[PDB]
Design a protein around this ligand. Structure first.
Ligand SMILES: [Cl-]
Ligand SMILES: [Cl-]
Ligand SMILES: [Cl-]
Ligand SMILES: [Cl-]
Ligand SMILES: [Cl-]
Ligand SMILES: [Cl-]
Ligand SMILES: [Co+2]
Ligand SMILES: [Co+2]
Lengths: 478, 476
């Protein structure tokens, strides 16, 4: 109240959103970003909060400004991250979620979503290969990884929950040198310390070497630490590599270790009958992290933690020593499953898109991203100046743009240094033009290279031809 | 293609406006649509399938999901520490979701990096600080864990690398009335729950400084290292406010990090009239404050504020050959401040509402909630069958409904056990009828915890809810 005013405000806001954020925001005819230096953007935004409010017209103008100067992450030429694109059904679900404004904490205040989340989690477990189990959604896959670490410690040393880490021996966990940095950040957060993380060599394709895993386990034991968890990666953030899960599982079983699979990125490939062999062996995991907000475009945040456990380990680990006077089955309440209290609804946006697309529609999208990745690799191999870092296993395509001044100069002593300066210059230019955005980074001894990501559901070959031609134009003088 | 997307989303928004926003804030509609779980399971037809569905089937699912969800903006929704729908905050939420980015780098969120900075700058200003640091968190429970982690790292930075076995045993202190995230957090961080020393609270639900200082001296005598005190400004059950100036005096004498869990009560800082409740907060090292509670910003909107200006936050949470020579000043990026990687934008919804209302409009709302709390107290005291648990100092009003069968029977030896059965029955009846939702809490006999927070609340709703408890409890 006033409801007329409320409806008119929201419809007028929503009109700006549809026109400026959704239509213009996903159009190749518009810019991916409107670069402004920080200090200049602050002036343009006029951010200082004040005692006096503003008019309806001033507010709507501010809505336009925020949109105008924001990055268009649904644009066909946005390649900067491991998510890209705007699924309309997911967005409808997001909008519904934000209007209902509840906490996913008890059946009492979130009955539709408590049941919806169970069912989504059940289907995700099925695609992993489990007909039973547990799990919960988390605010980001980094938190999912920490849940797994905490559960592994609890399962082996449940006295830790009450007595803390001084009642325990030193603990060691194991992960690939290509691991997401949430493993070490989590270890530090959980009190283990980053030193508890034993890094395992990866092979030329970026995949953990099971033989170096075993060596590392034995060495950690000889040094007086107690191995308790192995974390493999099914889809590394840079190369997009997939650890060999059946062989890592073998090492875990021989040593009695908890087997966690960080599939935040690659787990969505389980919807593709064609490409899900990349995760063969994942059904042997004790836990799996999986982020549908990446490859499936569900929207941040959409991160699930799946468990094979069927013994209420999740509630026993995180539940409060304190629901015995209610009129419904309290097993439906999920507060004891998490360290949060309030928790956003993150299942609707995925569930609604999934209902609209079908399993077939999402499989088709994944298969179309793998097919477009093949087109990008072919164009890179047929064009002068483009050099692949390694053959892609996923939708990460890593490559250099070799500018004319360096072609043939590989044997020169400063070739890797000179080449490392190319991507940063191209990034600045494409960003300041607004034509596209592509992530780049160095890697081991490798000079700065681009990491292209083929994921946007509306991507087309014409966009790959455009990005390659745009790099040639932007790097001609380098 | 674009015409079908616009058509779809406009169709969906029509339903959202009709069912969620207009019906969901109408006193004539129910607050919840109770269904036994198994009936709702079957009604919803949740099972995911190979084939997709038509636009028509999808729009039906949108209306169904809204129909059966609780209307947390309804005037008679009192179940939580949040209630109501601010349309500007909602407008900000809807923009955020359509821009779908990560509050991570200026490069992919240039507007929101600068926006969060200003918002946090203002929040610190209301705490009483003209400098500092901070970040937004996915819930106040995590805000509290950050504070625990920061205090640990600030005293024992070797912990980040070597972990807790390289440290002495550690002790933190909170009130008996504190939020359970303190104890879940301690376990999560490897401290163990035994590290949390519970301090007695007084008759009004407030930490007793004398018992805090005692527990601190004891922990030392047992060989532990006291390192943190966590106070609460606005407890979840009684809405008490710990005496922050006296607690600060204690932390100061023993060199302890002083954290104020103001998730609930922090918003009172916007009120010149009522902010005295948080006197002494300016002396804290850290403050948790949830605008999604009393300011109605939308879940999640939970700030962690630090007086620190030395990048303690980045040293604590930061991830540590050829140089990635980004072309702008990466000091602007906030990825190292948090243990997440991806992070939602949560500042727009708050900022847009603040621009619309001004600090003056938000202060108006807070003062109006306090005044309506006085009204509710008055009506409880003037009505037969209602007994206040204690005098409220915030917007939480804790009270029993004594049904006719127990009026006068206080001295019976089993009066309490019979009184404690009343609220669970009234709760079941009000949920299944759908006219209102009020939480009750065991803490003596199960009492109700009313919460006066919804911005559209009026006297008529307080009259209604008292009348409704009488109706629902006349046969008890
Ligand atoms: Cl990403
Ligand atoms: Cl959340
Ligand atoms: Cl399916
Ligand atoms: Cl709450
Ligand atoms: Cl988040
Ligand atoms: Cl203000
Ligand atoms: Co080539
Ligand atoms: Co009375």
């Amino acid at each position: 109240g006033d409801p007329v005013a409320v409806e008119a405000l929201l419809q007028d806001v929503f009109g700006i959103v549809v026109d400026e954020a959704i239509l213009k925001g996903t159009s190749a005819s518009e810019k991916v970003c409107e670069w402004k230096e920080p200090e200049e953007l602050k002036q343009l935004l006029d951010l200082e909060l004040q005692s006096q409010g503003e008019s309806r017209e001033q507010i709507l103008e501010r809505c336009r400004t925020v949109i105008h100067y924001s990055v268009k992450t649904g644009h066909p030429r946005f390649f900067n991250q491991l998510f890209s694109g705007l699924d309309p059904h997911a967005l409808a679900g997001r909008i519904i979620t934000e209007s209902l404004n509840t906490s996913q904490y008890t059946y009492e205040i979130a009955p539709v979503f408590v049941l919806m989340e169970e069912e989504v989690l059940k289907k995700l477990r099925a695609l992993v290969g489990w007909n039973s189990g547990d799990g919960v959604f988390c605010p980001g896959g980094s938190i999912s990884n920490m849940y797994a670490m905490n559960l592994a410690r609890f399962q082996r040393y449940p006295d830790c929950k009450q007595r803390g880490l001084r009642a325990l021996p030193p603990l060691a966990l194991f992960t690939s040198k290509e691991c997401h940095y949430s493993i070490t950040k989590g270890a530090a957060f959980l009190g283990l310390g980053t030193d508890s993380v034993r890094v395992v060599k990866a092979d030329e394709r970026g995949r953990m070497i099971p033989e170096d895993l075993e060596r590392q386990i034995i060495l950690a034991e000889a040094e007086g630490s107690v191995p308790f968890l192995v974390s493999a990666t099914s889809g590394t953030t840079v190369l997009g590599a997939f650890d060999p899960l059946d062989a890592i599982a073998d090492v875990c079983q021989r040593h009695g270790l908890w087997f966690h699979v960080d599939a935040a990125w690659g787990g969505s490939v389980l919807l593709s009958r064609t490409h899900r062999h990349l995760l063969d062996g994942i059904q042997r995991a004790d836990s799996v992290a999986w982020n549908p907000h990446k490859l499936l475009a569900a929207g941040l945040q959409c991160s699930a933690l799946l468990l094979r456990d069927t013994s209420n380990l999740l509630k026993r680990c995180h539940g409060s020593q304190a629901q015995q006077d209610k009129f419904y089955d309290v097993a439906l309440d999920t507060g004891d499953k998490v360290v949060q209290c309030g928790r956003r609804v993150d299942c609707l946006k995925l569930w609604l898109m999934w209902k609209a697309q079908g399993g077939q529609g999402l499989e088709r999208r994944i298969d179309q991203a793998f097919a477009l990745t093949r087109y990008l690799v072919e164009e890179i191999k047929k064009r002068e100046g483009f050099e692949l870092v390694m053959e892609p296993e996923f939708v990460n395509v890593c490559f250099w743009f070799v500018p004319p001044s360096l072609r043939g100069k590989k044997e020169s002593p400063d070739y890797s240094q000179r080449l490392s300066q190319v991507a940063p210059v191209l990034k600045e230019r494409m960003v300041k033009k607004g034509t596209m955005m592509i992530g780049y980074q160095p890697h081991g001894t490798r000079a700065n290279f681009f990491r292209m990501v083929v994921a946007n559901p509306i991507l087309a070959q014409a966009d790959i031809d455009f990005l390659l031609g745009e790099l040639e134009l932007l790097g001609q003088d380098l």
